[PDB]
Amino acid sequence: NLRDLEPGIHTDLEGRLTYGGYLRLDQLLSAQQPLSEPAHHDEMLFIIQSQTSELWLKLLAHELRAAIVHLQRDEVWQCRKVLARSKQVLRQLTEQWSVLETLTPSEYMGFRDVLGPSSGFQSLQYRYIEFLLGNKNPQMLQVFAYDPAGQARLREVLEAPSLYEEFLRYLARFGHAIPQQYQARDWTAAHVADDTLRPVFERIYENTDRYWREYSLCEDLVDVETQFQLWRFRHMRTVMRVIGFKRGTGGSSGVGFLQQALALTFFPELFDVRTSVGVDN
Amino acid sequence: KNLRDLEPGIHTDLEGRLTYGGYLRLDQLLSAQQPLSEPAHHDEMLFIIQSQTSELWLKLLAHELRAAIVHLQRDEVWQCRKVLARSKQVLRQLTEQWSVLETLTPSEYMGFRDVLGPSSGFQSLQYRYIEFLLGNKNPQMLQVFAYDPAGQARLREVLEAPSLYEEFLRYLARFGHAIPQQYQARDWTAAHVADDTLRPVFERIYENTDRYWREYSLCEDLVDVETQFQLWRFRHMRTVMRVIGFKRGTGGSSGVGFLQQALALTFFPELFDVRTSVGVD
Amino acid sequence: NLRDLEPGIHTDLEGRLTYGGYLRLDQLLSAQQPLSEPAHHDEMLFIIQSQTSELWLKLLAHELRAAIVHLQRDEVWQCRKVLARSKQVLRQLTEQWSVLETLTPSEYMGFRDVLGPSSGFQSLQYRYIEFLLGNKNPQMLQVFAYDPAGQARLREVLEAPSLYEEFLRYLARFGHAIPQQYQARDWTAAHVADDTLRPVFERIYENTDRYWREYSLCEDLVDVETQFQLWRFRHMRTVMRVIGFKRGTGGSSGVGFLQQALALTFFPELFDVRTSVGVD
Amino acid sequence: NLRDLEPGIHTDLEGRLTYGGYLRLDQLLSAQQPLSEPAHHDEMLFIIQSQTSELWLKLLAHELRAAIVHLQRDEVWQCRKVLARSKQVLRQLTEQWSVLETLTPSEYMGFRDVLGPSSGFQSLQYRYIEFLLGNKNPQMLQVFAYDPAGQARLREVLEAPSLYEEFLRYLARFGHAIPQQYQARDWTAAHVADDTLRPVFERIYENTDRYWREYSLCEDLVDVETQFQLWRFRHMRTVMRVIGFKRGTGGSSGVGFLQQALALTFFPELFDVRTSVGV
Ligand code: HEM
Ligand code: HEM
Ligand code: HEM
Ligand code: HEM
Ligand SMILES: N[C@@H](Cc1c[nH]c2ccccc12)C(=O)O
Ligand SMILES: N[C@@H](Cc1c[nH]c2ccccc12)C(=O)O
Ligand SMILES: N[C@@H](Cc1c[nH]c2ccccc12)C(=O)O
Ligand SMILES: N[C@@H](Cc1c[nH]c2ccccc12)C(=O)O
Ligand SMILES: Nc1ccccc1C(=O)C[C@H](N)C(=O)O
Ligand SMILES: Nc1ccccc1C(=O)C[C@H](N)C(=O)O
Ligand SMILES: Nc1ccccc1C(=O)C[C@H](N)C(=O)O
Ligand SMILES: Nc1ccccc1C(=O)C[C@H](N)C(=O)O
Ligand SMILES: [C-]#N
Ligand SMILES: [C-]#N
Ligand SMILES: [C-]#N
Question: Which amino acids does the record list as binding substrate (chain C)?
């Protein structure tokens, strides 16, 4: 009922790279600082739930920036591999709601007051990803005005073409009928749905043998949006079961404010084309 | 607009108050990723994040299992089962996240595996703590932590205490089951040996579920925990097979074969063994 | 790279009960009849996606009926074990959307034509489940006029207390302040949120040590509702990526009509009590 | 707390194609015929668990046959799209074990005896998939003697090149150093690992810019094999918690005989090349 230690296994790493040194585990595993007094059992779940999410969001931003570089270089297969990993990261972010759903309102009311006004609405990394996918709201910079350095990193992504705008620029380089404004415009203004892209996407979806690279990237972007909307929905269903329709710590109306983001679309013309697409030829 | 306006009442004057980033210590958490490849390797951020998210979930899993043991010691069955239900979800997220790392190819990994030196998850103190708590106590593993005295002392404290499984047997003894007296006090550093005298104890529980509903539900909770842990081991081992094949491990082991030896172990043997003789309820 | 057969393995199955015989697989695996001419590759996925869902809905109704019978008999642990299986069945119904999301609009437009007016709106088993959980709608009976035996089955569940009403009757039996109307009423009417139940759920969630059975079942129902809403949401997102805002085959506006079901609640007082619960 | 019907909704479906009609739900939903007397609550789960699996295996066979046709035609992107769906189908087959794990041994012992010798060892569609992916075993044909039509469909896939063999023939068409034997061989023989393929896969994995199609397909097949092994493992863990180390209804030793299949490989040279690939 025991596995013997194999010969050859290293035990003295004191002058070599260590597992705890590589992964900076003393730093990482001292970052959990529950505030309840006396200690509340459920506050450790609460901290770890958001911290695991912030680590996945860090990786998601790293991958999405690389997907943008690939698109800029017309490196389609490399972009698609990076988007495949991005999808898996968003899947873990969505799946993990099942842990926090074991937190009841009885448990949460034991420590919610220690949070003060702290909220996920104040997540810089979340807002960075929202902006990079295209949901640019300059009103969010004033939310971070109390933190100038974070505000600057959000302004940077605000001023750059989104992942979706980089996709349109890739379609323009391959002779699609992309309007000239996608070559240069005020990137800080959120993309507005453009009916002139309808015939561009109809031609891709209806001639998939010719436009297989474009078609596969369209579907990768619908997959990314769909998974992000599921993250939003599972978060909002968690809020409903934990605080119901109470106002949020961050000062919003709570569920209704979250429902307003579920009504937004990152890649509107990819959804809109469904109403007019015919059979593949 | 397909922009969400900021609601009135949202907190933005946050320079002197607790914020999300403050509460969750995100300056500390998100400075803990220190890739070593020169020049930078794209895939090293995934590699670090994959292990760090796992270590955060293992930290929560130890926190929950300690509480499940306290509840069992106090005969608090419904509370114990609620903590076990969360423990299962945590083990499920640890298992599901293998899907992210399976996007790492051997081509990618060979660009930075040499930076890791002898570092390995085999050297994870929190993983070893969980293995010991569930009852896979191998005193040979203390020498892996010989150069971390505080860590070694933490692993000795869980070595010297009854496992979660031994606490379940002690709970069964308090409710009049035919538990041998050795489970009241024995050398707990010695890993549990499968005990044929427990066979009739488990047969009686599984065949009289209306009388022994509390016991039956806890048996099934433990079988769930074991099965999810074995799934974690299997998915890790399948990931090792697709990334390094049958290469020896950084930690100095044979790799896949050494991992297969742990898959062969059972935490709760009498609960599996009873299946060969149980009849109808 | 070959596993040898062990000697004791039964290889002469002529006249014996076989896997295929027990599971009626001749019957099951002859029930897929694509109508596209010539055959469209993607139509097999389409049929299999809904048929697997309907087998899961068949099991979900079987379990939820058993959960009601346990509640009626105050058999709480049995009820919880049946609700645990029910949650896992709803999890499979929700997860499997990932398969259908590999169907693109230009694939579907190859065969949508063959479906005529056919729609999951006309799923008797889905509606049966919706009714049993408590979203009763007598307007649906007319949809099943074409199938009088099916229609009667839907009317039977319409006329019996829901899962939620059987929960309230269970609370009444253990001295909770459940209004007398839950003892007997016209069950064909969809439950409407009842403010007078707030103090009942406040007491349960604020004294979990005393009311652990009630607390556990409350959380089980919130879990069932949450997973049911995630099914609706994943179905709706699949509709958006396959037909967008096109009208549905069944004659509805499509996404907007589906979004109206997302605003329905099975267990309204369990969600409402979150605004007033105040430390246990 | 009620949604009104919109006026455009079709409510008069007498004589029209309905959901139930299109999906043959009369035929599908009469296919559950439990044998316990009196009826055992858990037998419905038992039948539905295998019947949902058999519907997914029917789609999986349908998709993989299409993946082979695309490979035969050098249609790499279409192949990859069908393998992506195949992966999702294998994920549902693996995830659904979580339902059957709510079956305890004292429930199953209430009706196991009604099954007689019936076993998933006798799943034609499972064996068809196993053979198509490359784990050929002529000893299985005798199991299906009772079903002459089924046996012949299983002998056909036995005698056809595997998905893996079709991949190697694809690599041979694009100038990779694939031995001549993969042009015509006795296909009823299971593929043994071939050390002459190591340099072929080293070149693909070490030059991914040049061999991006091949590399992408290599990873698709490693994905399919990994997900298939996870189905085997989850089934084997379910057997352990339901019957433990009892002999199987099908007459095998049970868990140990299942564990032997976990050591089988569909695409051995794809795993073997991990020990020699460089940066
Ligand atoms: C008990 C669990 C939770 C509750 C009750 C909750 C509640 C809320 C509420 C009420 C809001 C709106 C802003 C406000 O007024 O505070 C919000 C926003 C948000 N929450 Fe949570 N949340 C929960 C868990 C989480 C977790 C675990 C994360 C993980 C990072 C998260 C991330 C966010 C994000 C990013 C936003 C901004 C969404 C947007 O602007 O559209 N929340 N949450
Ligand atoms: C590229 C991915 C991975 C490879 C190739 C790999 C390889 C290995 C190898 C070869 C071993 C045996 C010890 C050794 O010789 O080093 C091992 C053990 C281990 N690995 Fe990993 N691993 C991977 C990812 C992970 C991740 C992400 C974690 C998460 C913390 C992890 C946790 C562990 C643990 C806890 C053990 C000890 C298992 C036991 O003692 O039974 N590994 N791994
Ligand atoms: C290509 C995939 C699908 C599309 C485009 C689609 C579209 C729709 C639409 C438009 C409706 C509204 C009724 C109507 O006008 O027809 C609907 C309702 C429904 N669909 Fe689907 N559907 C899809 C797949 C599925 C699948 C696989 C199921 C599996 C059972 C399903 C089950 C239902 C159910 C139960 C309803 C009624 C929901 C309610 O009344 O609130 N659908 N679907
Ligand atoms: C209560 C649950 C289950 C038990 C106890 C069980 C047990 C067994 C056993 C003992 C065998 C070995 C052959 C024999 O001696 O009968 C086997 C093989 C098999 N079972 Fe199951 N099984 C279960 C559920 C399932 C389900 C739900 C499926 C769904 C398709 C399935 C598919 C198979 C297949 C395909 C094999 C052949 C595997 C191979 O040849 O390597 N089983 N099962
Ligand atoms: N988007 C799905 C299906 C898919 C795979 N390859 C594609 C190529 C084109 C269109 C869709 C796809 C996926 O990535 O799994
Ligand atoms: N073990 C499964 C099924 C289950 C639920 N309640 C139970 C009570 C007794 C035995 C098994 C169970 C679970 O925890 O979901
Ligand atoms: N509802 C969750 C958490 C839970 C488990 N047991 C409980 C008892 C009481 C309240 C909640 C729970 C579940 O079923 O896993
Ligand atoms: N095999 C993984 C990762 C992947 C995506 N695209 C690739 C291209 C080449 C190599 C691997 C990949 C997948 O299909 O998601
Ligand atoms: N997930 C968090 C992480 C850190 C700090 C707070 C939260 C919250 O969930 C608070 C939530 N906005 C609330 O209204 O209760
Ligand atoms: N997950 C890790 C985290 C930290 C340091 C190393 C690893 C490894 O996976 C190394 C592995 N044992 C190897 O043999 O390649
Ligand atoms: N899932 C089905 C099963 C059977 C028959 C139709 C469907 C549909 O999805 C049709 C859909 N209502 C449509 O608007 O295209
Ligand atoms: N899943 C099945 C479907 C149909 C008929 C039998 C089974 C079994 O699981 C029997 C199993 N081989 C046993 O040993 O109990
Ligand atoms: C969310 N806070
Ligand atoms: C849905 N039809
Ligand atoms: C397998 N029966």
Answer: 46-50, 108, 112, 249
